[PDB]
Write a protein that binds this ligand. Structure first.
Ligand SMILES: CC(=O)Nc1ccccc1O
Length: 150
């Protein structure tokens, strides 16, 4: 009973979380997941500030109200070569990665690793935070509050 959460640098508190190496998070799960990091789904303004500090990914993820990809450098296979906060307009499907926002993080680029999941609750899952540098933090718990996400 294991969940891997690949996390990134935080940029103005915003970071990306990919679950189990595939697009697999629902919007309800995403809010609960960010809450386990003492975080919330970023607003579009929080995400735009994170973008301005150096944040970009090549994955769709929830923010408050939309599913987006922050892009700095045009890349043909990432958000169709767009720059800025690219908003997904048309999709059949509901599961993506998520972005999270931690107001207590540093104001600009924080590329230290994540070494805790401070607000997860008691549960049976071995949850492993995987950093981009491969360092890991694991803890037994749960973060999902909606049965349909389990
Ligand atoms: C203060 C701070 O940097 N908190 C935080 C941010 C992202 C993931 C886990 C964390 O504990």
């Amino acid at each position: 009973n294991q969940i891997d959460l690949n996390v990134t640098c935080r940029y103005a508190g915003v970071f990306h979380v990919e679950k189990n190496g595939r697009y697999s998070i629902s919007r309800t799960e995403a809010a609960d997941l960010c809450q386990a990091f003492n975080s919330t789904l970023p607003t579009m303004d929080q995400m735009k500030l994170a973008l301005s500090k150096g944040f970009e990914t090549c994955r769709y993820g929830f923010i408050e109200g939309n599913v987006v990809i922050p892009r700095i450098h045009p890349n043909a296979i990432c958000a169709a070569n767009h720059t800025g906060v690219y908003i997904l307009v048309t999709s059949n499907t509901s599961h993506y990665d998520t972005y999270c926002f931690n107001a207590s993080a540093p104001p600009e680029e924080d590329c230290t690793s994540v070494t805790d999941l401070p607000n997860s609750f008691d549960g049976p899952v071995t949850i492993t935070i995987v950093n981009r540098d491969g360092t890991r933090y694991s803890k037994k718990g749960e973060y999902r509050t909606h049965q349909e996400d389990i």
